[PDB]
Amino acid sequence: ENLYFQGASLTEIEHLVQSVCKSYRETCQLRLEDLLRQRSNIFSREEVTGYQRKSMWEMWERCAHHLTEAIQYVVEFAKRLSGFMELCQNDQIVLLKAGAMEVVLVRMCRAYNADNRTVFFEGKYGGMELFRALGCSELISSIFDFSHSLSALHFSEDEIALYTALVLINAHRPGLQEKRKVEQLQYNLELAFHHHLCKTHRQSILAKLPPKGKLRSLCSQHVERLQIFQHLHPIVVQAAFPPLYKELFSGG
């Protein structure tokens, strides 16, 4: 079905590095150069106040829409990823349901400026205070902290490509039917990532990477906060939240 569902040679691992990096470059939503250039474009005190005065539900809807747009690029990344389309549909959905948000959270560190603790949102950079109307301060602060920690690693685009491919191809996801096929694909993607680190003298980041339960904790907190919001504004979720967002985070 795919070469990467079996043991791969060094030459095949080298090809996998290139393939993953190409798939990422074609699906990365925003260019790193564009994000870096925009660092000087910061929301004014008046703009921040405007976001803070928005209703909780208007702010949740805006953020759900932005997250859904980012997730759509992750779905395209998955489709272009060696071996992914050779998995069964059940397993493709299991992997995307569990991993799409995790991939977005990792990608987000490119849009986060560690110098002033701001994130690119709706055309400009703003601090965590921009999200005060959401009423999930702990989750927002946890996401900013995570982006800060990833930013300290100074990831290259290729490192993000390989790391996010691994976040997605996780054979430990509950519900996988063809677990052994996923395990082999994961092993080869682990080799590709570690090969690239070895070749670029970046193996020192391995001990500095987030622990696996960190991404899981952020995703669990997001689903919990959505459930609290849904109790407060159920018709907002039913009428105005993106269908893909509901399919992933509120069982449809």
Next chain:
Amino acid sequence: KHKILHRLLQDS
């Protein structure tokens, strides 16, 4: 139901 993911995965 998985209405959107199935469609995105099937669209080439």
